[model samples]
Target: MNYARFITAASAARNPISLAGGLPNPNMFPFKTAVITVENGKTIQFGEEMMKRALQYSPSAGIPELLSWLKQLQIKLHNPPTIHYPPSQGQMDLCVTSGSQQGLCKVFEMIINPGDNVLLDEPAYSGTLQSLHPLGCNIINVASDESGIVPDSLRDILSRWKPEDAKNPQKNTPKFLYTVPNGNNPTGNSLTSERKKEIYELARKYDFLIIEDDPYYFLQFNKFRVPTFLSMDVDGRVIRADSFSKIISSGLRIGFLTGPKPLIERVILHIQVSTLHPSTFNQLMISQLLHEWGEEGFMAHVDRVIDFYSNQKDAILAAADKWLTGLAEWHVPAAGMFLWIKVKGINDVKELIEEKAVKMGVLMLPGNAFYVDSSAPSPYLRASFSSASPEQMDVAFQVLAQLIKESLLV
Candidate 1:
């Protein structure tokens, strides 16, 4: 209830604040609701005719043309091994959503029950922690190593889950394990292909679903891409929710969910009654973008985006080395928007973010905020290099480093 402060325009101050929300540039969205155009032969290529469709309501599942194209793209990228009750085509089915955030909530509604054990990364997407508050699920965390979820840790948790661990001890496994496979929210570590294979096996062995929430799958810093769990799933267990927020313009608020049609049908009902469908206008815009670019063009753009962030990653890493080497330590993120940092001698990072980082004109999200219980103490901090420039990043880290030292009386 208190988090509602964020959406209340009356409560929010007018200034650059936290990285809690996005501010997307409108220039990237060239698609307009009203337009007029014609090809050389005098037939309208993309104009008012198309705008008519965009202005009208689309199917709850999604725009047929766009949904079909996205399904093809998903199939081409991740050659699913096999599935239990596959969606007609023997490949994963797609359901459009407001964003991956919405996609996650829908999946939760369809599966989770109060007291259900939900496995997630320790310092996860803060929004995820916030989202789970209403569900009353038992949030269990799987530990992570440099490359993301440690398979051994996952095995330990899954192997040891007692009947009590289940909502109804009499029956049921932990509802599902939620993960951001690539560019993990706070950590930004990609799961290795081998590690992914093992985790999938554990899910099979444990008999639980795996929620693969992968918005940053396209943002890998290296040429070596980790295969998605969806690709490895043979028994209809993986539920993948993808977003265009990071990859494209966030303002469009577009995303899709890939999973079994039977389950997806439930989510579709919720979608039909709720948002009715993702913005028809935005769907058309993204559809056109993908259609015009084709698969090759889309991948080419992904590479360029990765290249852009690679420079930013370098800047922040160098800045850490130069300014906060001893005061803070972190893994050089392989992909994603954040640097999950471990601050020396500080357990209550949430306190530091509010009291110290604010004074320094720096806004750093504390690891405690990402925990299931917000008041929990943690030494970690999550800093994003996506929006800040290299120069600003240097200044920001320098300020944060000095603040940490002073806090510790160093």
Candidate 2:
């Protein structure tokens, strides 16, 4: 859409040198930062020109320099084998957002209408679930295995969807399939490449778009990495949402959406009237960080994150084995912050989380929070390994184990 030039025109009027917009005079505006030295600790004055660019308003689609850099990064990471997804002519694009959640909300608004069907992973992200109610979205829940979304279950749902069965009674096919493809929210499971390939094909066959929400892509524990669904998309149907919150600083509040150009154009238009743009200052800071890291250095940062979490995972696993081995069954998570635990004797985890666990000072989220029907009974608990010490984790599990043992009598 040539938004770069469009924004200037949209904000421009006969200002040649006079007044029109909100921009302040660079000479009068005063806010500057200093460059610091390590080792001995020293400082230097870098200048004012650099300060103005960081302080001013940016394009709604995002800063062009940052957008292009992100586009380059996506291509480097996914590579995508996108040649097969022709007419795209390798013309994929990106839009920077305040956060991935912003992109999610906008996409939901950009698409769904009234009671039209929407497919989400059975235990979907709670935030995504909240967005459904306002639209009166007819939520179709797809089951998932340890490897995230089960392709067979997805196909079954799509094939069986009928216009008469939906609340709208006018729309049969779903608008899009929403999922957390890697280190899923409540359940820390990643999708296998084989599964994504089949799911992508199903989207093509059933004619629905795919929303690949991947916030934990960099936290993978194993030596192997799965191909992103966007990389496998052949028809430009996959729209991937990525976040810097986990990998970098969540406070930075920067996220990126990469997809077919058509969808991005609509997203950009919506962003313009909404947020207008992500923080100009934050965007440039991130751009600077990436420029220093390049691809290899960025990957090095990812590796360090993996090592840190791997240690946490090991510590929590040891604690679980010591305290709850016989009382609970759980798989060692491959990535992200959670251990999805199923208490052997419990039918639903609500009471445990609210009454028993809370009373003992061991806090954990009930599995129902991740469910399509939040009130439904679930035997699982999502415990995180990111913040506690091994000793603290041991104590938490000690309480959990005793609680489960006590539940046996009741």
Candidate 3:
């Protein structure tokens, strides 16, 4: 099979209205304030001090000061303080990446031999799934509910899947369990703290690492922040990949991986070979901003962003209820920017886009884009309220409702 050609074609042909792309709204970005800080010469002063003076080829692990500050940040978030350095077994280590996607690819390179059993939550992040395809890994889809991956479903898979019995020892064990614990990309489900504990316990019992890919942690709208799988992981089995894209700036291309030292060391080695290191300029700039703003200011800034997303989500929900209740069904998301709507009579929404909606100028992401297989049946569509203004939202909802009504007539 020409796997490269197949993947390239599939990706290029993906529909353009992609609510499935896990991107934060540009309006939510703190650009104006960040610009003001730059205009005041603070950004330059801090960047020159940290990058030019302190910049050298950093350790294979990471920049020490930034790592220490991140460790302290973990402590503030109630995780163990023992995450200061890489463990000797190379099980876990911290390495800055160009983005969380790079971190995902690096881990796959380190652990995945051809035909390895790789488990993913159903309706998983599409980019990660694409990355896994070329590796010839056996992809298993785990069942997920509103709270995300079910522990019992994971336990069931673990009980049945035996990696050691394979032709290769590396392929025998399920390499890792991957999930988006907070505000899951396509579903917008934030797993509860209780669910986190359950999943953590299962990982310990099964002896497989949990890849907690939580880029949307800070964006959750629930009044209480749920404990992370990493925090609940007593056995150090959770490898957490986090990003600053949602909270700060996406263009900066900054993300970090936190887990047991041994696994991290392997990932770091891969990073050393491939990218060498994440840009020192970006890391130092963020570190300086973090140091200057301190934890309190950062938290406050995050909260403001969350509030903005929440309001957008609420506006969409209200509009859906007022205008779309009979035409469609949707749940109000507790966090994140999307409202997942399942329109009542549209089975071929992907085709119907050009008939009436395209001419009317309203657009939305079809649910098939979120599935592992794009040809699968999906009555659902995703609409993001965050990127559009309140004024724009009213018209968008009306157009969507009209489209649904038109479809029902057909």
**Per-model TM against the reference:** 0.86, 0.88, 0.83
Query: Per-residue lDDT for 1-410 in model 2, tens only?
Result: 12121112232221217578877766665677635332222233335776677777788878888898888888888865543344334347688999988887877777766666788886777788888768677898888889878899998887785433323334566778998888887788888889998988888776677889988898999677788988877666777899998977799889998876656666778777778899887887777666666777678788878889899999999999999878988888877888989899889878977998898998999888886677879998989998899989999999989888887888
True lDDT of residue 229, candidate 2? 83
Write down the lDDT that model 2 would get. Answer: 0.78
Q: Largest TM-score belongs to which candidate?
A: 2
Question: Backbone collision count in every prediction?
Answer: 0, 0, 16
Question: Model-by-model lDDT, in order?
Answer: 0.76, 0.78, 0.70
User: 1 or 2, which is superior by TM-score?
Assistant: 2
- Ten-residue segment with the worst summed lDDT in candidate 2? 1-10
The 10-residue segment with the lowest total lDDT in model 1: 1-10
State which candidate, 1 or 2, has the greater lDDT.
2
lDDT of 1 by residue, 1-410 (tens): 01111111321222216676443443345555453332221222446557666766788788898898888877888876544343642345679898888888877776655766777877788787888879778888889877889998888887765534333345546767888888888888888888888988887676677889999888888687878988887877777898888887788888889886645666777776678788888888788767767788788788878988888888888888888879988998988888989988887777778897998799988787777777768888888889898899899988998888888984
Candidates 1 and 3 compared by lDDT, better number: 1
Which of the two, 1 or 3, has more TM-score? Answer: 1
Ranking by TM-score: 2, 1, 3
Q: For candidate 3, lDDT tens digit of each residue in 325-394? A: 6987876675666777778877767765556667888787777777767787788777887688877788
- How far does residue 366 in candidate 1 sit from its true spot (Å)? 1.4
